[PDB]
């Protein structure tokens, strides 16, 4: 049996008192995570190959992944059963290489580590042919699977509220890889459409976004002994909420006590990105990103997200560094022009085995500094029926209320492994 | 560790619109399964010899089963765990070659893999002496548990509503099999008794068939390269509702709004069964079922159900073929006397490890189409409480409503892959 | 990958009628286990070396811990995540041989196995620096967290029904083991403080216990081919309730209808026990227990237990036995005075892997029959709002109605295996 995942796992406490807490900014889809991450998180992996006659195989593959709160020993949970696909290598003659897989699968995801960010993400259920050899470069296709809570009506209603069935949205994509745009250097190109699926006789709200597009571009650099992505992405309607491949075209929303509220995503999201990993010497490791993301809603709720932050490792012994990490974020709310912003500074001693800034597992010791001073954020007091401005961005002080994390200050510290195998 | 499982997984599309959907016939106990499944099912077992001397081990197995839609990647679920057992293989001189086991285990359980069927599988917490060598035959001992949610009162009440403690049923197998009845065929039978088990001073409703009677013949000829299988079961009173070996003495069900009603189960049921794969030539394999059920109940409302279907799979490689299924049901309602039928057909294309059609994993891409004309279905409307009819068979146009899913159409697709190992 | 665990499993029945029961005596913190284990639970340990150099190395473990009824088959559960934790041994010069670890463990437990009573067991999400060689032993600094459900107020109430949040507690360990007090003996230390840990401005009730210690001495005796070992442990307020080096600092407990109710630990409790297993001859083993633990609150609602009990083994054969366990306890309510006392005999017949009274997988086959007599318990009816003395020690026939087992007997039997791999 193949046993590989991931998990990360410790104990912390907050300089003010208590339990360690975690610290992101209102408005912003990520956290530095570097002695920034408040649970404990594994997949579980248990695959293998099943058949293989030459150059033929079969791989089955399963992922199970559990999150707990560790602040207790017994935690009892409810597991996500994530994957289990079956992928056939070489099972055709004609398009050699190649392999054709069905089943729960995360499908060439692209993300950015320190940060904790997919970017380009669309796994769940689905089928493909993966690995096309093109000559140029390698072409894949498959067609992936989510489902919204709710957001189709059996009836046409003009109430919101009657809109509760699940709606299954899918997504369509087509990678071209590998191309060698240059020397040392590679690009991608990718293209989703993704589209609410109904079923007969079943109706979305009126205005309902229904589907989208997210065009990708990555260029990898190879570079000081490391890598360089330069990402470019850009999402249309459906595709702008989730941001990742991932297609919600009904537009409708579920508060707490069960009651739908219009979220409509027409619009469109431009994400410019840049991360890589450099070594520099033999000391010195630094992982490092640079992001701008707008989404840009017809609805006037978007947002503008700026990112940066470094994390740079130096290394005292090939199995001891001392790690540190820096990381600043601001937002600023589409409908009310105001800005939440942070900055982040983890200074942490690390024991991994082996030498790279990407060596797993790594037990830290760390101590983290946030300072935050957020001037706006979402409405989620009362209900989708008492609140009509509910789920809106609003400003700290409306209506004499509060909302966002305020203009503050703490600091953490604690232990903590993390691992991939 | 032994890493051994079954999973099926996959992506699907309906006809008229939306996420694929599975058709089952009103009042069948099953539904041809290519092209008609519609969850991710999977089953991870971890075992392990943990000591062996000679003729003599100890053999620790688990299996801990996992079912989700499919509808999305993250997908929490409360998994069954279903086997923790320990099998002693000849720690007994006097009955050598025989095992003695403790612990939850899938018991011998015989079933019909196309429509998947189980129909004699006792499984549960349980224990046993296992084949132990008779000269014609080898016999067989266990005493298997299960428990019915309520069915149980504290006191004496004339109010079914009283009787909602779990009531436990327990079952005593015994089984003689691998008789040679003849050349090429095999012959086994197994007795099995049922009774619920009533804890101090409880009762049952007035009434209750308390205990009953399953008795199995299966005979096994080998033939075409392949076998089949010829099985005659006839069970009485407790063993007649779920009908595979476990006992339901108490009568009582519960409505979803907590609700006892009077689901009594005096009667019978009469099953004769022939399955069996069949091989012709090195191009075709081809499975197929024929059945006829009858549940006969005091209370009138029992089923007569027929199945029929073939899964011939023609290869056109070692690794690649072309399978298709047809299956038809008609199930007459015992009440009303009405029936419901349908008739599915799906044409797979597959890739599979092997060049049986018993070869896992399979990777297929199918077309299913089911078209069915239902004139009965069973009243679920209101409650225990508000309905007096709850749970019986009732015409399709019954009382101005409707019941069972009406004469109709509907074709799927798409992709999915299935494994056991 | 490593596979290892825990698990119990089997079928059993009451004399009386129904389902297997098991006898624990009222205010006892335990029960006898051998025949009179009551559900399956298992632990399914993954674990695996991921990085070896010379004599460093980096080990990985996980827990995924299941418990069901075993009255049924398919058994839906939320499992508990346990562990998932990495060991990094050798990683430092300056203090060779020692181990640093982070991630939930379960950490140095130690426990009386027939009565299944861990008395020194701090696990849960933790970190610390183990096996320090210091000369004369070796110690061990760790530091583990656990987390009350409510207890905490956000402002200033009076009212306890305003202590609903969560409260966690932080434990700081020391122990030195391993020092050889005397030929064939060695001696641990342990020093346990424990604190309930508050977020800023958050206040626990009037007169909360807050903190505490716990102080052990473990003293381990090669004897008779086995060993014994004598512990005394005291602990200190909110060290008392849960009494194994875990603390409760808050004094706030929650009834089934969400009411907090104060059941504050102020006092100390004493503990003094010895247990062990020693072979004598070839054909005995023999486990034994007896202990005094004495929990004195100030709030007058402690309770003073006394066991005893001895599981001897007689081996008809290297791998066959009779095993037997013979079972006494006796608590005495701090409150009333009155006393709860019972015995249990239990009777098996087993087969394992090995010829030890520890040796694991079992398979057995058992009688018990417990006879008890129980003047007092609990009064949990009501609510802690209707009810003033809810959760209070109170006489049997208090106020008419009924507190206790009662006096009595019952008798069960059954098969089950039981395995530690
Ligand atoms: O699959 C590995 C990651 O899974 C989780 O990530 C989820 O949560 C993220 C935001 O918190 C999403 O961006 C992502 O799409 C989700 O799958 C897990 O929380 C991560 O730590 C894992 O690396
Ligand atoms: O254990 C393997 C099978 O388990 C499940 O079967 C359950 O559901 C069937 C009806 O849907 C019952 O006949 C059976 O007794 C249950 O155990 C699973 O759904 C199957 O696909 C598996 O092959
Ligand atoms: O981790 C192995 C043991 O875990 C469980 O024990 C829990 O319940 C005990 C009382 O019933 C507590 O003393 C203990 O602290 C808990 O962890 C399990 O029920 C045991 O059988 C296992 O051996």
Redesign the interface.
């Known amino acids: 049996?193949d046993?590989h995942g991931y998990?990360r796992?410790?104990?912390g406490?907050?300089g003010?008192?208590?339990?360690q807490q975690c610290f992101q900014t209102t408005g912003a889809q990520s956290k530095y995570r570097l002695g920034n991450e408040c649970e404990?998180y594994?997949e579980?992996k248990?695959g293998?190959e099943?058949?293989k006659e030459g150059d033929?195989s079969?791989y089955?593959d399963?992922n199970?992944?559990?999150s707990?709160?560790?602040?207790?020993?017994?935690?009892?949970?409810?597991?996500?059963?994530?994957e289990?696909?079956?992928q056939?290598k070489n099972?055709i003659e004609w398009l050699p290489g190649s392999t054709?897989?069905?089943?729960?699968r995360?499908y060439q995801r692209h993300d950015v580590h320190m940060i904790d960010f997919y970017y380009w993400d669309i796994?769940?259920?689905?089928?493909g042919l993966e690995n096309i050899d093109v000559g140029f470069g390698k072409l894949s296709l498959a067609?992936?699977?989510?489902?919204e809570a709710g957001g189709s009506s059996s009836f046409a209603s003009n109430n919101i509220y009657d809109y509760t069935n699940?709606t299954?949205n899918?997504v369509f994509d087509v990678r071209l890889a590998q191309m060698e745009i240059n020397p040392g250097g590679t690009l991608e190109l990718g293209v989703d459409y993704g589209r609410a699926?109904?079923?007969?006789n079943?109706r979305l709200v009126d205005g309902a976004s229904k589907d989208g597009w997210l065009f990708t571009a990555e260029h990898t650099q190879s570079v000081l002994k490391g890598f360089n992505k330069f990402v470019v992405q850009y999402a249309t309607d459906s595709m702008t909420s989730q941001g990742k491949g991932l297609s919600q075209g009904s537009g409708v929303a579920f508060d707490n006590e069960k009651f739908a509220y219009n979220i409509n995503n027409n619009g469109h999201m431009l994400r410019i990105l840049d991360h890589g990993a450099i070594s520099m010497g033999d000391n010195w490791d630094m992982m490092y990103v640079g992001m701008y993301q707008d989404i840009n809603w017809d609805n006037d709720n978007g947002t503008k997200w700026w990112t940066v932050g470094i994390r740079p490792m130096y290394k005292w012994t090939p199995?001891?560094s001392t790690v540190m990490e820096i990381g600043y974020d601001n937002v600023e709310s589409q409908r009310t022009g105001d800005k939440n912003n942070q900055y982040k500074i983890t200074l942490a001693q690390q024991?991994q085995?082996?030498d790279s800034i990407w060596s797993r597992?790594a037990?830290?010791?760390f101590a983290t500094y946030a300072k935050w001073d957020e001037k706006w954020g979402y409405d989620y007091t009362g209900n989708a029926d008492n609140n009509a401005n509910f789920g809106k961005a609003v400003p700290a002080d409306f209506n004499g209320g509060s909302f966002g994390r305020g203009d503050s200050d703490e600091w953490t510290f604690?232990?903590?492994?993390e691992?991939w195998?």
Do not use: C
């Not at 003010?16 to 339990?19: D, F, Q, T, V």
């Not at 054709?100 to 729960?104: D, N, P, Y």
């Not at 067609?143 to 489902?147: D, E, I, K």
């Not at 604690?414 to 492994?417: I, L, N, P, S």
């Open positions: 049996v046993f998990a796992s410790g104990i406490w907050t003010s008192g208590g339990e404990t594994a579980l248990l293998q099943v058949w033929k079969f089955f399963t199970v992944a559990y707990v709160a560790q602040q207790n020993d017994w935690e009892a949970t409810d597991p996500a059963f994530r289990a696909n079956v056939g099972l054709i897989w069905a089943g729960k995360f796994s769940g259920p689905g089928a067609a992936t699977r989510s489902s699940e299954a899918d699926n109904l079923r007969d079943y199995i001891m024991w085995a082996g597992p037990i830290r010791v604690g232990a903590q492994m691992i195998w």
